[PDB]
Amino acid sequence: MQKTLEVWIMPNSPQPAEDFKALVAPFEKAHGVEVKVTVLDWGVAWTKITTAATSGVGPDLTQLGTTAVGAISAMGVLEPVDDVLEALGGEKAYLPAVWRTTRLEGARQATAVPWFSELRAFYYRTDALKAAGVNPAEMFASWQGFEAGLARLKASSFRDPETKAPLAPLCTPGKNSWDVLHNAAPWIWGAGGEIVRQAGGRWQSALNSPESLEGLYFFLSLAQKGYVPAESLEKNTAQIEADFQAGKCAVFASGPWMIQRAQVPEAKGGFAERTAAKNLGVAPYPAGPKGRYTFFGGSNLALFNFSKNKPLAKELLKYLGGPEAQVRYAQMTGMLPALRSAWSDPSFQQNPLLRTFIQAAQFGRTYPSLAGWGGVENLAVQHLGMAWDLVAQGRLTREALKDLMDKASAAINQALR
Ligand SMILES: OC[C@H]1O[C@@H](OC[C@H]2O[C@@H](O)[C@H](O)[C@@H](O)[C@@H]2O)[C@H](O)[C@@H](O)[C@@H]1O
Ligand SMILES: O=S([O-])[O-]
């Protein structure tokens, strides 16, 4: 007799199903319904979602990554959710970058409800910067400051108290990570570039624009100038997080989840005992030639238009999208709320590192919600990876980067036709 809603999620928190069921238990009691959650392993999440969309067999609600909204929306399989967004405060309730992820680009109606936001900022070793005579305020004020700070960090005599070795100035992945384009995007944007741009109602690559090439080379060249260890370029973001925790890196970019890890003993997967946890700072990405930008991703929630339970599903979207559940689930995931009013909650404001992430959040920017986004990103990342391979050999020239981005741009433009 009790009605059920089926919800698909990805592994967003340490106990994905149990955490999600705790989160919705008050909703279940209030409506007299049961929520049946299925956790889609990141290895299979996108294929399961695509099959639901083509077969018309699947859950009531699914999590969608922000960059997937366009593709699933373009299939015509998602219920409009303008009513839910208006209930939560409408366009003004969201950072504009997050609002853009509610619909296919150009669409009249919203098809996704923002759930949580992934953003990246720079963690740094407060002990290392102090030793190097680098002030964070100045290092993160400008690209020129940022590179000058890395130069000072490379020259510094400072040794980690546990490793007994100097720190790498900057650690970053290259091509062997899920977030190759995301790591590049703030540098593209800060120079005045873009991955794709709309001209005359038509989307084309801008990776080979002068401004994109300026930002890309600024970032990639740090590794050829000695500021990034060759071994970092073999690794993914999770491995670079481990190197920072281990005291091997003065500066590296990640999300807000590292702050919770810094409070958790090493025996439970954290790094509380390590020098890095006791000497931890955060700064936003440095202001570039045209602007300061912070990468945003994360996930939204969508309702399949073949659902038999649309009213109750939209009540659950309002609950998950709304203030109380936004704060609770951002804490569980180590993410930031998608609902901007939640950024003022004391769970963010009481922690200095989370306050800096809130500062970084106001500069947020995301990719356009294109149906063809995955093709764009895939072709961009293949060519950026060839650029990272030249970096690893010290052979990335300006001209070599332009050749690779022209090749990427030709392939992207063909894909978008
Ligand atoms: O798939 C597109 C989707 O990806 C989202 O990130 C997923 C990412 O999460 C990491 O923690 C995990 O280690 C990776 O294996 C996994 O791919 C992203 O934030 C969304 O914006 C994006 O659309
Ligand atoms: O098109 S400009 O805003 O990146």
Position 126, amino acid: T
192 alpha carbon to ligand 2 midpoint, in Å?
Answer: 7
Nearest bound ligand to CA 72? Answer: 1
201 alpha carbon to ligand 2 midpoint, in Å?
Answer: 14
Q: Is the CB of 290 under 6 A from ligand 2?
A: no
Q: How far apart are CA 365 and CA 96, in angstroms?
A: 8
Q: Is the CB of 178 under 6 A from ligand 1?
A: yes
Resolution limit, Å: 1.6
- Distance set, CA 131 to CA 14, 99, 142, 168, 247 (Å): 36, 42, 21, 14, 15
Q: Is the CB of 154 under 6 A from ligand 2?
A: no
Q: How far apart are CA 324 and CA 113, in angstroms?
A: 16
Q: Phi and psi dihedrals of 274, rounded to 5?
A: -85, 155
Q: Is the CB of 334 under 6 A from ligand 1?
A: no
403 alpha carbon to ligand 2 midpoint, in Å?
Answer: 22
Asked whether 115 and 332 are in contact (CB, 8 A), the reply is no
User: Which of 256, 268, 317 is closest to 80 using CA atoms?
Assistant: 317
Nearest bound ligand to CA 12? Answer: 1
193 alpha carbon to ligand 1 midpoint, in Å?
Answer: 23
302 alpha carbon to ligand 1 midpoint, in Å?
Answer: 16
List CB contacts of 254: < 8 A, sequence separation 6 or more: 120, 121, 123, 237, 240, 241, 244
Hey, where are the domains in the chain? 1-120+295-369, 121-294+370-417
Experimental technique of record: X-ray
Q: For a ligand 1 pocket test, name from 48, 63, 299, 377 the mutation site with the most ligand atoms within 8 angstroms of its C-beta.
A: 299
List CB contacts of 155: < 8 A, sequence separation 6 or more: 132
Residue 87, burial from CB neighbour count under 10 angstroms (0-12, 13-18, 19+): middle
Position 144, amino acid: Q
List CB contacts of 199: < 8 A, sequence separation 6 or more: none
Asked whether 389 and 234 are in contact (CB, 8 A), the reply is no
Q: How far apart are CA 210 and CA 199, in angstroms?
A: 17
In this structure, the residue with its CA closest to atom 10 of ligand 1 is: 178
Asked whether 250 and 153 are in contact (CB, 8 A), the reply is yes
Q: Phi and psi dihedrals of 111, rounded to 5?
A: -130, 0
Q: Is the CB of 241 under 6 A from ligand 2?
A: no
DSSP code of residue 165: S
29 alpha carbon to ligand 1 midpoint, in Å?
Answer: 31
Report the relative pairing of strands 196-199 and 168-171 from DSSP bridges.
Answer: unpaired
Distance from the Cα of residue 19 to its chain's centroid: 21
193 alpha carbon to ligand 2 midpoint, in Å?
Answer: 7
